[PDB]
Design a protein around this ligand. Structure first.
Ligand code: CLA
Ligand code: CLA
Ligand code: CLA
Ligand code: CLA
Ligand code: CLA
Ligand code: CLA
Ligand code: CLA
Ligand code: CLA
Ligand SMILES: CC1=C(/C=C/C(C)=C/C=C/C(C)=C/C=C/C=C(C)/C=C/C=C(C)/C=C/C2=C(C)C[C@@H](O)CC2(C)C)C(C)(C)C[C@H](O)C1
Ligand SMILES: CC1=C(/C=C/C(C)=C/C=C/C(C)=C\C=C\C=C(C)\C=C\C=C(C)\C=C\C2=C(C)CCCC2(C)C)C(C)(C)CCC1
Ligand SMILES: CCCCCCCCCCCCO[C@@H]1O[C@H](CO)[C@@H](O[C@H]2O[C@H](CO)[C@@H](O)[C@H](O)[C@H]2O)[C@H](O)[C@H]1O
Lengths: 64, 178, 80, 161, 42, 178
């Protein structure tokens, strides 16, 4: 289960962080189309280091 | 808080007075730039080479192997006289020693990876001269002090030979000033 | 006119609407995000295609997109 | 082979170049007084020029019809000093620089100062890596066979295709 | 030696210049003492 | 834990004592990256080529085929002297044999490395398989080293091995060749 503190690999192809690992910051309730908030070490081209993903778009690596 | 040998300077943090030869001498604070374990190993190794080299310089002035190739009583000139093929065999044998003695761990990153590895200690005491703990501790300091002295001596011997082109003893007996 | 589209990754931050100098965009109610709103482009006949909206958008990739299209006096920004 | 070339010591054009170069310098020398700083400077150039031409003559480097040294870089060992030996020297040095630089980069990534240590170098850490470069070929080879040299293709970011 | 000063001497451009200057000096000094090495002598 | 051949290095992870010719010698660790069966096949193929090559390098010095064309005791010179049609036939055999090895490794990966089912006399059948398997590799490894010697020395001397030893042509006066 993806939850706060999980390390996840990104599977969204249009993402700056495609195939990279980020840290889950929060998971939103339900009904939200992209509830998994992930933070990254690298900034993208716009200068941001956080993005929202669906469950389909991520896969867990580490447990917490 | 101060160095023992240079009393107006703060003691270098990595010199704790434990290691043999330590009188807190590091006024340039090199032991802050470089790893102290690697520095200690390097110091002993430079010392052991120079001890042999010092003896080498003298004995080569008197004793020789057979042949005119192994003549020449000036050590720096003898380097270019002897067979070059022989120097390669020494070099490659030293290479093998360096590899085996250090168990293939030859850099500051890995040489002291094993906790038991201590600078200069290759477990070489055939005759068992350092069986007594107290005697060995004295010998550790004597080894370093003699190595330090031999380093400066060999520095002399070489520069004297470059200046005169005479042997060590030849120069003393026939001392010519500048 | 230029085409402006808003995709469902919008997080309803309002920054595109605030950035727009031609009042092309507005926020409308939505269920899809925590902010309970989405950007909308009801007045694209006034869009000049400056792309300030896209500059403002924090999502990766963008949630608002401007496809430059058929030019008009409005879109070319002519005062003559 | 190399019938279009000749050893520079056998070359008449190469020798004429020496003569003409010196002849120019001796004309320049005649404008100054013996013992003057200018005179001594020109003399040093004359000596240096002579040394260069004689060094090349004694080397067995080949000369073209222009009377200039031409280097052979096809791999034959009689011209190893012209390219192969310089090449080995370059690879050894350049590989060292690369290897120790790669090692430092990886070390600081395992810290909180991953970015700071790129613009403000951790000099002790850097010197440790720089000191360890002398066996970079073996290090690199073992790292390759261990599977520590390369990331998997699936672990590196790519754009859409 | 002062830690803040040492930190300043560790900045990229200062180390950059010092290291390049030493390297450049080494090449200059090799060419000053062993000039005109078109090839390795053997 | 540790390699037998290099006691201060770790045991190669993907090699075992059960393998023929095992001495735990893989310091560069090629067995970690590349497929071990493939390396074992490759080693055996080199072994077999070099054993024939080594023997073939020396036998002509003692006895050769009855002609002038097959009389060159320098093997690399002999290659230029002998009939081209003869060399073509040797090549076609080699190509035929490699077609069979290709077929083995492609369509029969179950088979043991080096196993072409060739044991007419049943020498390594019963309780001598392990022994002969090791003997094959040890003799092959020796021949591989020997072929390094033979090839490079012939290049220098343009003589057979026994001709070199007899004339005492021990040192290179001919390098560089080109
Ligand atoms: C282990 C085997 C081994 C073998 C077969 C040789 C064989 C040789 N050595 Mg070497 N040598 C060896 C170990 C060996 N060495 C080691 C371990 C050292 C360092 C301790 C040396 C240090 C050495 C020197 C300094 C010289 C030789 C030289 C020689 C050659 C001439 C000696 C002679 O026959 O009179 C001969 C090829 C001589 C040579 O190369 O002749 C030109 C020579 O000058 N050797
Ligand atoms: C194949 C041969 C071989 C191999 C594999 C080794 C391997 C090693 N040597 Mg050994 N060494 C060798 C031959 C070899 N050595 C020979 C023939 C001698 C002369 C007897 C030495 C004398 C020697 C000394 C004195 C030391 C080593 C050290 C080492 C270790 C570090 C090597 C290094 O970083 O060098 C790469 C070289 C450099 C990073 C810089 C030096 C550059 C050249 C080679 C020499 C510099 C001369 C110059 C005058 C220095 C002073 C300049 C100025 C400051 C005044 C490593 C285990 C060191 C050690 O164990 O430290 C803990 C060490 O201090 N070796
Ligand atoms: C075009 C590619 C090419 C490559 C990769 C090499 C590569 C090599 N050659 Mg060179 N060589 C080449 C073209 C090439 N050669 C050509 C066209 C000639 C004729 C002009 C030569 C003539 C030549 C000689 C005479 C020798 C080499 C040798 C070598 C080796 C050192 C190295 C394997 C040396 C060697 O020892 O080969 C094994 C050697 O002696 N080459
Ligand atoms: C340790 C540093 C390091 C290493 C190991 C590499 C390695 C590589 N580079 Mg990269 N590169 C680097 C730094 C490095 N680079 C820097 C600083 C730049 C900005 C100029 C680049 C810009 C660059 C480009 C544009 C390209 C490469 C390419 C490559 C690859 C082929 C070789 C090459 O073309 O180099 C060429 C690189 C240069 C000429 C740049 C100079 C390298 C500097 C001098 C190294 C800096 C060393 C560093 C300051 C040392 C500090 C260490 C100390 C603190 C311990 C190879 C993977 C090529 C590639 O992708 O091939 C597949 C390629 O096209 N590099
Ligand atoms: C890729 C480009 C390139 C290459 C291959 C060369 C190659 C060479 N240049 Mg040229 N040069 C170049 C670009 C290049 N240069 C450029 C762009 C300029 C204008 C700035 C020059 C201006 C120039 C002048 C004015 C001179 C040279 C010289 C040389 C020779 C120096 C030999 C030497 O120092 O060895 C020694 C090796 C080192 C110093 C590096 C080794 C590092 C240490 C010391 C060893 C460490 C141990 C491991 C060498 C043939 C000199 C020459 O003699 O020409 C015949 C010379 O006088 N170069
Ligand atoms: C020539 C090919 C060859 C091959 C494929 C092998 C393969 C093997 N050996 Mg053997 N070995 C060989 C020659 C070879 N050996 C020789 C000549 C000796 C005598 C010293 C030995 C002595 C030996 C011992 C004592 C042991 C092995 C072991 C092994 C196994 C693990 C080590 C390894 O992966 O080595 C692969 C390494 C290489 C192929 C050498 C690296 C080559 C260089 C660095 C690269 C470039 C080479 C060259 C220029 C390329 C030319 C290409 C060609 C087209 C011309 C593996 C099956 C171990 C084992 O467990 O046995 C089952 C073991 O304990 N070998
Ligand atoms: C890789 C292995 C190999 C290769 C490429 C060669 C290649 C060659 N051999 Mg050699 N030879 C070999 C192994 C090899 N041989 C072995 C193992 C023996 C011992 C039986 C011989 C005994 C031998 C003799 C007596 C003669 C040659 C000769 C030759 C040359 C010309 C004709 C011929 O092939 O007769 C091959 C002769 C055989 C008796 C073949 C035996 C079959 C095995 C399997 C090979 C040719 C360059 C002739 C030559 O020109 O010598 C200067 C020649 O008179 N060979
Ligand atoms: C299977 C049928 C076969 C047939 C019909 C031949 C027929 C021939 N061989 Mg060949 N040969 C064969 C298999 C065969 N070979 C095989 C399997 C090998 C490798 C073991 C060879 C290796 C070989 C060599 C090295 C030479 C011949 C040569 C010859 C020719 C001259 C011998 C003679 O007739 O007196 C003859 C056309 C000789 C030749 O072609 O000289 C002009 C020659 O030098 N053969
Ligand atoms: C040519 C021919 C001759 C044959 C020559 C032949 C037989 C003579 C061969 C002599 C050899 C065996 C001497 C061996 C040389 C020994 C060397 C000099 C040892 C190096 C030690 C190092 C310097 C250790 C340093 C270190 C130590 C201190 C500590 C470690 O930690 C680090 C290292 C860095 C390894 C003759 C005689 C017949 C005459 C004829 O006319 C022509
Ligand atoms: C010999 C010779 C020649 C030729 C040559 C050739 C032809 C070569 C080739 C080569 C090749 C064809 C190669 C390839 C390769 C590939 C690859 C793939 C690579 C890789 C690499 C890497 C990966 C590396 C890395 C590193 C290191 C190791 C160090 C530091 C840095 C770095 C990290 C970068 C000539 C005639 C000129 C001259 C004479 C001699
Ligand atoms: C057919 C060609 C025949 C010629 C081959 C010649 C090569 C002979 C190989 C000797 C064995 C080398 O074995 C190799 O040693 C080096 C140390 O030197 C080891 O290297 C290890 O230590 C070094 C320094 O000590 C570290 O920088 C490195 O990170 C680490 O991997 C390798 O793990 C090992 O694989």
């Amino acid at each position: 289960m993806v939850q706060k503190g999980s390390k996840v690999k990104i599977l969204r192809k249009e993402s700056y962080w495609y195939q990279e690992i980020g840290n889950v910051v929060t998971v939103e309730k339900s009904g939200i189309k992209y509830p998994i908030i992930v933070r990254f070490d690298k900034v993208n081209y716009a200068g941001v280091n956080t993005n929202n993903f669906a469950s389909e778009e991520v896969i867990e690596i580490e447990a917490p | 808080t101060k160095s023992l040998s240079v009393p107006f300077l703060e003691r270098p943090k990595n010199l704790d007075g434990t290691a043999p030869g330590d009188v807190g001498f590091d006024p340039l604070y090199i032991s802050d730039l470089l790893d102290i374990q690697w520095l200690r190993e390097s110091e002993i190794k430079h010392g052991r080479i120079c001890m042999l080299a010092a003896v080498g310089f003298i004995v080569q002035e008197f004793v020789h192997l057979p042949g005119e190739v192994f003549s020449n009583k000036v050590a720096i000139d003898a380097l270019f006289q002897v067979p070059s093929g022989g120097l390669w065999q020494i070099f490659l044998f030293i290479g093998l020693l360096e590899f085996v003695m250090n168990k293939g761990k030859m850099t500051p990153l890995d040489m002291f990876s094993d906790p038991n590895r201590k600078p200069g200690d290759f477990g070489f005491d055939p005759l068992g001269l350092g069986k007594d703990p107290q005697a060995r501790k004295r010998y550790e300091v004597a080894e370093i002090k003699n190595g330090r002295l031999a380093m400066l001596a060999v520095g002399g011997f070489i520069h004297h030979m470059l200046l005169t082109h005479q042997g060590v003893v030849e120069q003393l007996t026939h001392f010519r000033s500048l | 006119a230029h085409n402006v589209k808003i995709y469902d990754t919008c997080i309803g931050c309002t920054q595109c609407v605030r950035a727009c100098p031609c009042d092309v965009l507005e926020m409308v109610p939505w269920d899809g995000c925590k902010a309970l709103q989405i950007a909308s482009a009801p007045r694209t006949e006034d869009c000049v295609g400056c792309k300030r909206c896209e500059t403002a958008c924090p999502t990766d990739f963008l949630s608002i997109r401007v496809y430059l299209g058929a030019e008009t006096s409005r879109s070319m920004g002519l005062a003559y | 082979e190399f019938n279009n070339l000749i050893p520079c010591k056998e070359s008449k054009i190469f020798n004429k170049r020496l003569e003409s170069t010196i002849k120019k310098l001796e004309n320049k020398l005649s404008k100054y007084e013996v013992g003057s700083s200018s005179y001594l400077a020109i003399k040093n150039t004359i000596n240096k020029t002579n040394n260069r031409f004689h060094k090349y003559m004694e080397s067995g480097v080949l000369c073209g019809k222009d009377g200039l040294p031409h280097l052979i870089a096809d791999g034959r060992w009689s011209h190893a000093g012209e390219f192969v030996i310089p090449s080995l020297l370059f690879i050894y040095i350049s590989g060292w620089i690369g290897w120790v630089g790669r090692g430092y980069l990886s070390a600081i990534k395992n810290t909180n100062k991953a970015i700071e240590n790129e613009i403000i170098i951790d000099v002790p850490l850097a010197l440790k890596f720089m000191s360890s470069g002398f066996i970079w070929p073996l290090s690199a080879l073992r790292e390759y066979t261990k599977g520590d040299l390369l990331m998997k293709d699936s672990e590196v970011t790519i754009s859409p295709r | 030696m002062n830690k803040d000063l040492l930190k300043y001497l560790s900045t990229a451009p200062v180390l950059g210049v010092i290291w390049i200057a030493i390297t450049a000096a080494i090449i200059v000094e090799f060419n000053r003492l062993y000039p005109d090495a078109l090839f390795f002598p053997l | 834990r540790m390699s037998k051949a290099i006691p201060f290095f770790p045991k190669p992870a993907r090699l075992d004592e059960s393998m023929p010719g095992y001495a735990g010698f893989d310091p560069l660790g090629f067995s970690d990256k590349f497929d071990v069966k493939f390396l074992q096949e490759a080693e055996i193929k080199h072994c077999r080529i070099c054993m024939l090559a080594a023997l073939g390098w020396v036998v002509p010095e003692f006895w050769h085929l009855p002609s002038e064309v097959f009389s060159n005791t320098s093997p690399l010179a002999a290659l230029g002297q002998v009939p081209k049609l003869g060399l073509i036939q040797i090549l076609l055999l080699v190509l035929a044999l490699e077609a069979i090895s290709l077929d083995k490794i492609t369509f029969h990966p179950e088979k043991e490395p080096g196993d072409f089912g060739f044991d007419p006399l049943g020498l390594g059948k019963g309780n001598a398989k392990k022994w002969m398997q090791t003997a094959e590799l040890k003799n092959g490894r020796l021949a591989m080293i020997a072929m390094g010697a033979f090839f490079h020395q012939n290049l220098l001397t343009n003589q057979g091995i026994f001709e070199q030893l007899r004339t005492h042509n021990f040192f290179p006066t001919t390098f560089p060749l080109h």
